[PDB]
RNA sequence: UUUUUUUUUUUUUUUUUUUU
RNA sequence: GCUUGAGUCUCGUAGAGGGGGGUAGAAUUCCAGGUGUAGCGGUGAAAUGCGUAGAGAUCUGGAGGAAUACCGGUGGCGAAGGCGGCCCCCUGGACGAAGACUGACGCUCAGGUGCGAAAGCGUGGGGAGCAAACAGGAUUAGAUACCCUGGUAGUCCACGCCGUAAACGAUGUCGACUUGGAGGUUGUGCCCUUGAGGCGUGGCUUCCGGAGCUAACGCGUUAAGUCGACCGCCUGGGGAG
């Protein structure tokens, strides 16, 4: 929902060698920048609940893909949180 | 009370749940341009307006006329007025001056205040109705076309511009919608400022009706030295009108100057 | 740039007012940078129903590649115009560029 | 038949009660009929297909 | 079928074998191919084959006698968690002596008879009769 | 819904408006309409007509 | 799929055994 | 280690839109005055108003209240409900696809979370036309009535405790089920597209087919015949909601 100024910068920062753009630390950096962008414009339209369940569903996934990553790969998980916080 | 900020009364913890709880609308000093209202009734001599108790009136807001039209302006604050329940606000005009204006609900930002012949349609001081569109809200209405504001307050009395009615003879209002007055009168827009102070009871009492006056409380009941009734023994029981002048329907008017009412469907 | 197919009806006999009044409607469309696929003087044509009593209109149609920021302004400056009988707006499923 | 210049030539499908007849009579493919239906709709509301006798 | 490993093995030999076929074919599984084997070697089916060896399919020649299913009187009795482990003399002895059942235990899948004679209890897969 | 007669010897050419507008419009409305129960009835009638 | 030409008419007691 | 259950991108495609917005159009009241004179509504039969202070209607001039009449369907969507014109914004669900990226992050749920048809509480009203109550004229074995003019509430609802009953495969979760064959529809691969669709083929839906199962109607594989993960309800009269 944000621009390719931030999202090429997410791929550069959270990838590891080649084609990582949809990989687990890139998808979670994605989803934490995308919420944090939607949190900038959700301030508008005043009746916006048509929109909102997206923002809500994608934060429940951010929490969930973290619950998964801990179990899968403890290095991946623990190095991710010192860049993005998100343990919530 | 269903608007926001609604400001609700407390829990039942004390004798006063209401009055109004609004933060952010009393300030001091009473700023340079002000005045008061004088003594008790003193009409000269045998006073006709009953029960009195007339101390502490007290201060009023000195801005009428308000004809400062096309000089643009901006908004420092909004306040209260306890004489009218009103949402009155501090308007700095960009020539070099500060006023007190009868503004609607949340007209601050500090906004884009400006009015007059053709120049604007915006939030606007006092605005001639012949120059501007149709709408529901109007407010000021110069009561006859050069006199001044019919409504000094934004208390919900929606007076409503109709479009092409009768050559400029607009407004669709409260007790007689064929009031028929010319669109050469001035509006402001609009009539909802403080709903909250008047959509609910302030008190049984509160300060508004005991620290500086008495309201009505009696006329008929007790002592026959006044009204046409009624013996004693707690009985009364009779035919007792409001003499010589009548009550629960009759009308009072025949003739007067203006007297433009034209249909007045009553009820 | 929605492809607004907009039909507007002005007063029938004002053949001298309308050539310039299209210039006073297009002036909102160029402002937008939006653009005219077709723009039709339909003439003094008769009416389906008795609206605004002179039993004809001066019909104008256009097909504008213009954004949503103009159409409530257009709607207003047709509606506030006491010479405008009725005015209506269709949109999208490509552009029309062929006359009627 | 999606747009204007063809429906001014197809007013044959208007029966005398002033309405658009069910295609039993010629037998058209669904895509083409469902195109012409929307070409007709824009021509209705714009009076370029001037629906029944007095309008 | 994954909610009950390996139960569909007993339903599929009922279905196809009622339904006019001399044949049925499916993906293989950790108990099914031993069941296929015992069903032939007792003779309740005519053959079985297994095919695509490196990731194989499992194929049984059903016994379409009179157009009715041989495995019409069948029941798969042991279910998820609520297992049926029975001692070497608690085992099935059904149809007044004519038998039989198919089990699994400490030597593979086998008939209840061949289990009783090896002197072992086990997992009661199905009452074949 | 507007229909001439010519030479008018009481011609009675006025007859073709029975197609819908004059004559068919009474399906709903008579005093009174039907109000409840006419909606699935329109498509119920499609089955009585198969002959 | 509009279906008010008047509203009502007390309890009984009939009752050809039986296993098949 | 995989079968990729699960998603986020990429890329497309329409309708009676979850919430705020803009709002297109018959009748017809009753009036300013333009008229024809006595008759207009109403019924199993007519009535109380009414009529030389003219029964409507019908023009012209005006003041108010604001359904969706249909390309509208021999139909379209939807979790139910439940909207009928079209549009601007928030842009539900989806879900037809070159794929990319991670490998069960999964299904299905009780207490709760939301939603919640009838109805009361509203708090202030938006105050057509019809019609419970309202108000009678009338048909009178009593009508405490149904008419017929007159009549509100229901129309709908900002906003929110709403349980809730007829929202029944008298019925969830579903994967394997591959005799099937016939329609009703939707999207789509391939054709000298001489073509009413030929060869195909999923989805949405219905039709209604053996071995079995089996009373009587017949139901005949996804359907009750196999196989199963539970969050359940199931304690007999009358005691009861």
Q: Which two tokens stand for residue E27?
A: 């993906």
Helices (H), A3-73: 4-14, 24-38, 49-72
Query: Touching check for D21 and chain F: CB below 8 Å?
Result: no
Looking at the fold, whether E51 and E94 belong to one and the same domain comes out as: no
Q: Let me know if residue C62 belongs to a domain.
A: yes
Distance CA B34, CA B27 (A): 14
> How far apart, in Å, do the first and last CA atoms of chain C sit?
21
Q: Let me know if residue C100 belongs to a domain.
A: no
Q: Is C29 helix (H, G, I), strand (E, B) or coil?
A: helix
CA of B260, C1' of H25: distance in angstroms:
36
* Resolution value (Å, 1 decimal): 9.0
Whether residues D42 and C49 touch (CB distance < 8 A) is answered with no
* Domains: count for chain A: 1
Q: Which two tokens stand for residue B246?
A: 């009548």
- C47-76 residues near strand H (Cβ < 7 Å): 49-51, 53, 68, 71-72, 75
Strand G footprint nucleotides (protein C-beta < 7 Å): 1-2
Nearest to B236 by CA among B219, B250, B248, B253: B219
Q: Let me know if residue C9 belongs to a domain.
A: yes
Looking at the fold, whether E9 and E65 belong to one and the same domain comes out as: yes
Q: Is D22 helix (H, G, I), strand (E, B) or coil?
A: coil
Query: Touching check for D3 and chain C: CB below 8 Å?
Result: yes
Q: Let me know if residue C10 belongs to a domain.
A: yes
Whether residues F20 and D54 touch (CB distance < 8 A) is answered with no
Give CA separation, E118 vs E102, E112, F28, in Å.
14, 10, 86
- Tell me which residue range forms the domain holding E53: 5-69
* Domains: count for chain E: 2
Distance from CA of C98 to the nearest CA of D (A): 8
Q: Which residue of D has its CA nearest to C100?
A: D4
User: What is the 3 state secondary structure string of chain F?
Assistant: CCCCCCCCCCCCCHHHHHHCCCCHHHCCECCCECCCCCHHHHHHHHHHCCC
Looking at the fold, whether E21 and E64 belong to one and the same domain comes out as: yes
Distance CA E72, CA E128 (A): 9
Distance CA B231, CA B163 (A): 59
Q: Which residue of D has its CA nearest to C49?
A: D55
Q: Is A82 helix (H, G, I), strand (E, B) or coil?
A: helix
CA of F44, C1' of G9: distance in angstroms:
45
CB pairs under 8 A between C and D: 21
CATH at residue E23:
3.30.1370.30
Distance CA E59, CA B62 (A): 102
Distance CA C3, CA C54 (A): 31
> Of E69, E87, E114, which residue constitutes the final position of a domain?
E69
Element (H, E) at E100: none
Q: Is any atom of nucleic acid chain H found less than 7 Å from the CB of residue A87?
A: no
Q: Is E13 exposed, middle or buried (0-12, 13-18, 19+ CB in 10 A)?
A: buried
CATH at residue E92:
3.30.1490.10
Residue in the structure block whose two tokens are 């003779």: E43
DSSP state of B73: E
Q: Which residue of D has its CA nearest to C86?
A: D46
CA of B8, C1' of H152: distance in angstroms:
36
Whether residues C5 and D5 touch (CB distance < 8 A) is answered with no
- E22-41 residues near strand H (Cβ < 7 Å): 24, 26
Q: Are B236 and B230 in contact (CB under 8 A)?
A: yes
DSSP state of B94: T
Looking at the fold, whether E94 and E56 belong to one and the same domain comes out as: no
Q: Is B80 exposed, middle or buried (0-12, 13-18, 19+ CB in 10 A)?
A: middle
- Tell me which residue range forms the domain holding A10: 1-88
* Domains: count for chain C: 1
Q: Is A34 exposed, middle or buried (0-12, 13-18, 19+ CB in 10 A)?
A: buried
Looking at the fold, whether E62 and E81 belong to one and the same domain comes out as: no
DSSP state of B177: T
Residue in the structure block whose two tokens are 């379409």: E64
Cβ contacts of A65 within 8 Å, gap of 6 or more: A24, A27, A28, A31
Burial C58-90 (b: 16+ CB within 10 A, else e): bbbbbbbbbeeebbeebeeebeebeebbebeeb
Distance CA B186, CA A26 (A): 62
Give CA separation, A59 vs A2, A72, A84, in Å.
16, 20, 14
CA of F44, C1' of H205: distance in angstroms:
19
Q: Which two tokens stand for residue A76?
A: 């991946």
Q: Which two tokens stand for residue D40?
A: 């007709």
| Domain range list for chain F | 1-51
Judging contacts by C-beta atoms under 8 Å, the chain C residues touching residue D52 are none
Q: How many CB atoms lie within 10 A of CB B100?
A: 20
CA of C26, C1' of H103: distance in angstroms:
59
- Tell me which residue range forms the domain holding C88: 1-92
Helices (H), E43-99: none
Whether residues D54 and F2 touch (CB distance < 8 A) is answered with yes
> What approach was used to elucidate this structure?
cryo-EM
Q: Is any atom of nucleic acid chain H found less than 7 Å from the CB of residue A41?
A: no
Nearest to B153 by CA among B81, B239, B217: B81
């Amino acid at each position: 929902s944000l621009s390719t100024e931030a999202t090429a910068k997410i791929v550069s920062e959270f990838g590891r060698d080649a084609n990582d753009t949809g990989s687990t630390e890139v998808q979670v950096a994605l989803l934490t920048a995308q919420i944090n962008h939607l949190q900038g414009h959700f301030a508008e339209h005043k009746k916006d609940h048509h929109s909102r369940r997206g923002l809500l569903r994608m934060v429940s996934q951010r929490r969930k893909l973290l619950d998964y990553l801990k179990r899968k790969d403890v290095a991946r998980y623990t190095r991710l949180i010192e860049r993005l916080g998100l343990r919530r | 009370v269903k608007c926001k900020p609604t400001s609700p009364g407390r829990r039942h913890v004390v004798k006063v749940v209401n009055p109004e709880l609004h933060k952010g609308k009393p300030f001091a000093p009473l700023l340079e341009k002000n005045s008061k209202s004088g003594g008790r009734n003193n009409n000269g001599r045998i006073t006709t307006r009953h029960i009195g108790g007339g101390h502490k009136q007290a201060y009023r807001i000195v801005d009428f006329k308000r004809n400062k039209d096309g000089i643009p302006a901006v908004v420092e604050r909004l306040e209260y007025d306890p004489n009218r329940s009103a949402n009155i606000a501090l308007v700095l005009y960009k020539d070099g001056e500060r006023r007190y204006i009868l503004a609607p609900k949340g007209l601050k930002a500090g906004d884009q205040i400006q009015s007059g012949v053709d120049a604007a349609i915006k939030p606007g001081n006092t605005l001639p109705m012949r120059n501007i569109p149709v709408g529901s809200t109007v407010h000021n209405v110069e009561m006859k076309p050069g006199k001044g504001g019919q409504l000094a307050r934004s208390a919900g009395t929606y007076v409503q511009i109709v479009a092409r009615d009768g050559a400029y003879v607009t407004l669709r209002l409260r007790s007689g919608e064929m009031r028929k007055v010319e669109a050469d009168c001035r509006a402001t827009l609009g009539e909802v400022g403080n709903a909250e102070h008047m959509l609910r009871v302030l008190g049984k009492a509160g300060a508004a009706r005991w620290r500086g006056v008495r309201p009505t409380v009696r006329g008929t009941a007790m002592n026959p030295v006044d009204h046409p009734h009624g013996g004693g023994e707690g009985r009364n029981f009779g035919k007792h009108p409001v003499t010589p002048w009548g009550v629960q329907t009759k009308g009072k008017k025949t003739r007067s100057n203006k007297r433009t009412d034209k249909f007045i469907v009553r009820r | 740039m929605r492809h607004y197919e907009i039909v507007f009806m002005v007063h029938p006999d004002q053949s001298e007012q309308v050539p310039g009044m299209i210039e006073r409607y297009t002036a909102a469309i160029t402002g937008a940078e939006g653009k005219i696929h077709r723009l039709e003087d339909w003439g003094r044509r008769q009416l389906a129903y008795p609206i605004n009593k002179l039993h004809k209109a001066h019909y104008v149609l256009m097909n504008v590649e213009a954004p949503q920021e103009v159409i409530d302004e257009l709607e207003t400056t047709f509606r506030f115009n006491d010479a405008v009988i009725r005015s209506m707006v269709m949109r999208t499923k490509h552009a029309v560029t062929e006359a009627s | 038949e999606i747009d204007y210049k063809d429906i001014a030539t197809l007013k044959n499908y208007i029966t005398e009660s002033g309405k658009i007849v069910p295609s039993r009579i010629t037998g058209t493919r669904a895509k083409y009929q469902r195109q012409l239906a929307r070409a007709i709709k824009r021509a209705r509301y714009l009076s370029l297909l001037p629906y029944t006798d007095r309008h | 079928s994954m909610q009950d490993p390996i139960a569909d093995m007993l339903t599929r030999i009922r279905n196809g074998q009622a339904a006019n076929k001399a044949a049925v074919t499916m993906p293989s599984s950790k108990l099914k191919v031993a069941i296929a084997n015992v069903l032939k070697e007792e003779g309740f089916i005519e053959d079985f084959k297994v095919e695509g060896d490196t990731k194989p399919e499992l194929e049984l020649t059903l016994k379409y006698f009179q157009g009715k299913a041989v495995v019409e009187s069948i029941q798969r009795v042991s279910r998820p968690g609520l297992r049926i482990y029975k001692r070497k003399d608690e085992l099935p002895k059904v149809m007044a002596g004519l038998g039989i059942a198919v089990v699994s235990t400490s030597k593979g899948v086998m008939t209840d008879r061949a289990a009783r004679q090896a002197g072992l209890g086990g997992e009661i897969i199905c009452y074949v009769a | 819904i507007k229909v001439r007669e010519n030479e008018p010897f009481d011609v009675a050419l006025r007859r073709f408006k029975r197609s819908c507008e004059k004559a068919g419009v009474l399906a709903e409305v008579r005093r009174r309409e039907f109000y409840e129960k006419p909606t699935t009835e329109r498509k119920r009638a499609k089955a009585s007509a198969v002959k």
